[PDB]
Design a protein around this motif. Structure first.
Motif, PDB file in Angstrom:
ATOM      1  N   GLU A   1      44.294   3.518  30.720  1.00 57.96           N
ATOM      2  CA  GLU A   1      43.549   3.755  31.956  1.00 57.96           C
ATOM      3  C   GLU A   1      44.459   4.342  33.032  1.00 57.96           C
ATOM      4  O   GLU A   1      44.079   5.289  33.730  1.00 57.96           O
TER       5      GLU A   1
ATOM      6  N   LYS B   1      36.637  22.534  22.871  1.00 58.36           N
ATOM      7  CA  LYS B   1      36.524  21.415  21.938  1.00 58.36           C
ATOM      8  C   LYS B   1      36.377  20.099  22.688  1.00 58.36           C
ATOM      9  O   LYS B   1      35.558  19.250  22.321  1.00 58.36           O
TER      10      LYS B   1
ATOM     11  N   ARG C   1      49.175   1.849  28.411  1.00 60.34           N
ATOM     12  CA  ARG C   1      48.327   1.644  29.585  1.00 60.34           C
ATOM     13  C   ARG C   1      47.487   2.904  29.773  1.00 60.34           C
ATOM     14  O   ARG C   1      47.763   3.735  30.638  1.00 60.34           O
TER      15      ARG C   1
ATOM     16  N   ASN D   1      47.809  17.830  25.846  1.00 55.00           N
ATOM     17  CA  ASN D   1      47.814  16.708  24.914  1.00 55.00           C
ATOM     18  C   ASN D   1      47.834  15.372  25.646  1.00 55.00           C
ATOM     19  O   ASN D   1      47.166  14.427  25.221  1.00 55.00           O
TER      20      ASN D   1
ATOM     21  N   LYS E   1      41.012   9.987  25.421  1.00 53.44           N
ATOM     22  CA  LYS E   1      40.477   9.604  24.118  1.00 53.44           C
ATOM     23  C   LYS E   1      40.675   8.119  23.868  1.00 53.44           C
ATOM     24  O   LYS E   1      39.823   7.465  23.260  1.00 53.44           O
TER      25      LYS E   1
ATOM     26  N   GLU F   1      51.688   6.034  28.574  1.00 51.60           N
ATOM     27  CA  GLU F   1      51.457   6.122  27.133  1.00 51.60           C
ATOM     28  C   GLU F   1      52.406   5.198  26.368  1.00 51.60           C
ATOM     29  O   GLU F   1      51.985   4.462  25.466  1.00 51.60           O
TER      30      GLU F   1
ATOM     31  N   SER G   1      44.308  14.631  26.809  1.00 47.23           N
ATOM     32  CA  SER G   1      43.456  14.241  25.690  1.00 47.23           C
ATOM     33  C   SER G   1      43.793  12.840  25.197  1.00 47.23           C
ATOM     34  O   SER G   1      42.899  12.019  24.972  1.00 47.23           O
ATOM     35  N   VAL G   2      45.084  12.541  25.021  1.00 43.12           N
ATOM     36  CA  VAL G   2      45.449  11.200  24.549  1.00 43.12           C
ATOM     37  C   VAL G   2      44.925  10.138  25.508  1.00 43.12           C
ATOM     38  O   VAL G   2      44.385   9.108  25.083  1.00 43.12           O
TER      39      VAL G   2
ATOM     40  N   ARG H   1      29.545  14.944  22.889  1.00 43.86           N
ATOM     41  CA  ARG H   1      29.213  14.194  21.683  1.00 43.86           C
ATOM     42  C   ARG H   1      29.266  12.694  21.945  1.00 43.86           C
ATOM     43  O   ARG H   1      28.398  11.943  21.485  1.00 43.86           O
TER      44      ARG H   1
END
Ligand SMILES: [Ca+2]
Ligand SMILES: [Ca+2]
Ligand SMILES: [Cl-]
Ligand SMILES: [Cl-]
Ligand SMILES: [Cl-]
Ligand SMILES: [Cl-]
Ligand SMILES: [Cl-]
Ligand SMILES: [Cl-]
Ligand SMILES: [Cl-]
Ligand SMILES: [Cl-]
Ligand SMILES: [Mg+2]
Ligand SMILES: [Mg+2]
Ligand SMILES: [Mg+2]
Ligand SMILES: [Mg+2]
Ligand SMILES: [Mg+2]
Ligand SMILES: [Mg+2]
Lengths: 9, 227, 227, 9
Positions: B24, B119, B22, B46, B53, B18, B49-50, B126
């Protein structure tokens, strides 16, 4: 175009 | 390929990736951490998700550029390349949904973890719905069902300012507007969510206040865009 | 994996990938185009450079973040992960250098193509030198030799405002300053390059003037940083 | 910290 939630909460 | 690395090392390297932007790598490390089979902490959720996303976010941005070129085009190249990016995006979403179904969601008992994962399930269905054409209706209902279950839990178990509850409602409202062609439902959800959070801000410390109001601003921004 | 795609299609998809900011795809498409065995046009050389410069640029930025953390650290994780990124960066540089040696450079007869490729060879040896420790001296001399050959051709065959000649001198000056520990050579090269370009601007059209002055500004920015 | 050449020329 609308904003969605940040990845972190 | 992460099976030989310690869980703690995978988490540490996800944090390093992070910092190095990087994403991937970060996603691969967090996939490996999830596959260790232990439940994830708040911080680890988190990270997961980071990572994904940002990965899917690059793919969505690319897909939108290519789709726009393809639409202004109507050689096979732009359609072929849009399809390649679309397939890669679907693979990332399927990976995330697979981690949620095997077995993050079923082992998530607390409201904070279960709502977070449900979520996420709504979010990645979505993203699949954004590119779907043939089987779009079943993908849309899968997103709706995950979001709805998450909403029902969040309304029973979390205060209206809880940042996961707020981000969930924000994204469900975007789902209604952009995916389900239900703009009035999107506006109603965003307005009711904002107003109920506003009335609960007085209970919060300064730092929780900052967390909740940041997401409330996104709801207000969308309401302004939509009305 | 690009052997079955038409050269023209690879080029078209490299242009699409650039618009989509998918630089790893762009690099793979341009590698495939090079491996068709035909010489590259001016536009195609630029696509090749844009693709790999953005790929290696992400790796260099990541490596610098990780190296800084590792230096402030003095677990094995940050060293291990820095080494992984470093190996991936070296693989990208080796791929580029392999394309130049097989067989872009030897088939490049015109000054514009040969100087472009020799500058690229200097650049990717320079990126290798940025992370080298054991065999750093031989990597440094390989960069110097490529840059020097490019310089000798550019001084004989191109006007001093030619943007490839200017970008080559800019990068050779960065090589002197950052890699070769020759800051006075870096400053002298940047100053002489700037002054000789200035005296040639009067020959240029408005659009060539904009191209050359943009690179001259980079030389001036570095001179300000260094003096 | 110094700037190098743009990828394109
Ligand atoms: Ca209405
Ligand atoms: Ca001096
Ligand atoms: Cl990445
Ligand atoms: Cl393709
Ligand atoms: Cl479900
Ligand atoms: Cl308005
Ligand atoms: Cl990429
Ligand atoms: Cl590693
Ligand atoms: Cl050489
Ligand atoms: Cl100064
Ligand atoms: Mg263990
Ligand atoms: Mg075509
Ligand atoms: Mg917040
Ligand atoms: Mg052919
Ligand atoms: Mg450790
Ligand atoms: Mg220029």
């Amino acid at each position: 175009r609308p904003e969605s939630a940040p990845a972190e909460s | 390929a992460m099976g030989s690395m310690e869980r703690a090392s995978l988490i540490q390297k996800a944090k390093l990736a992070e910092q190095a932007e990087r994403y991937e790598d970060m996603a691969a490390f967090m996939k490996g951490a999830v596959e260790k089979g232990e439940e994830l902490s708040c911080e680890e959720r988190n990270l997961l998700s980071v990572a994904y996303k940002n990965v899917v976010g690059g793919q969505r941005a690319a897909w939108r550029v290519l789709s726009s070129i393809e639409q202004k085009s109507n050689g096979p190249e732009v359609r072929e390349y849009r399809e390649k990016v679309e397939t890669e995006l679907q693979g990332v979403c399927d990976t995330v949904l697979g981690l949620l179904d095997s077995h993050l969601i079923k082992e998530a008992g607390d409201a904070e973890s279960r709502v977070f994962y449900l979520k996420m399930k709504g979010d990645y269905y979505r993203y699949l719905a954004e590119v779907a054409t043939g089987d779009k209706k079943r993908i849309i209902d899968s997103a709706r069902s995950a979001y709805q279950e998450a909403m029902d839990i969040s309304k029973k178990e979390m205060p209206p300012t809880n940042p996961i509850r707020l981000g969930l409602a924000l994204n469900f409202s975007v789902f209604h507007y952009e995916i389900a062609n239900s703009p009035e439902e999107a506006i109603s959800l965003a307005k009711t969510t904002f107003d109920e959070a506003m009335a609960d801000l007085h209970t919060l410390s300064e730092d929780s206040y900052k967390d909740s109001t940041l997401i409330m601003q996104l709801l207000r921004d969308n309401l302004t865009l939509w009305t």
